[PDB]
Amino acid sequence: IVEGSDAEIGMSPWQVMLFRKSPQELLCGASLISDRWVLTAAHCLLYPPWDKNFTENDLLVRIGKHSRTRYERNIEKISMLEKIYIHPRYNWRENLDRDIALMKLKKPVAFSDYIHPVCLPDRETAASLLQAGYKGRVTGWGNLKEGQPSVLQVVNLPIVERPVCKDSTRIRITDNMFCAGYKPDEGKRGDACEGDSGGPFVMKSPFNNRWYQMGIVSWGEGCDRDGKYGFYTHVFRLKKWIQKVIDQF
Amino acid sequence: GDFEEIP
């Protein structure tokens, strides 16, 4: 996160850390959607062009974390993965279209003050909230500049109009993505950066006071560059595949 | 890395 702030304790109890064993290291962000399911970006696990292709044996999920580096002895819970599911149509060849994956934990996590699931949007919620001008929130332990924080960082960014998104890159944008950030004429700045991938873009419904995950940190060219925007996986658009896997497994 | 060992 660039131009973010330290998160408050218990601010994003769904925030999950993807962590590799050997070498021990921070892979990506992720989100807790239930006691047994985690949502992340597919590119966190598979990206052939960088020879990236992780299996369940390769990683650990760290939940209820605040500190990037510390083993939060009485607070975090660490889980092993049972199985990984990448969208059958994730396009790592071209534009990271459908950048989403599900991870099934070996055992369910008990909730706590620091661990709690985020809601997945419904058609009406997605409809009311996914509006240009509307602000969402991103969190991660990623790079501070296009440099590593000691604690989870947070930033609030407005959804940008689809035309603007399209005109800011040479990359082929799809309906499965949305962009967010401030424009050069608004004087505020901030963005996600490497290390933040797989993290949630959340919005708080004004109807029911609940937090919903609308996006997954996906891609961007550099970080917090003027006239550029961060791209996120459009969660609602991929909801049927999510549901499909959950019911099926 | 910057990381405190995990049990």
Added chain:
Amino acid sequence: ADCGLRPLFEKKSLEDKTERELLESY
């Protein structure tokens, strides 16, 4: 279920330091 309601916030009726920014944009 009980999704999206944080134990230390919504459940206790406390607001985080910048959530108002979000709500104000809606």
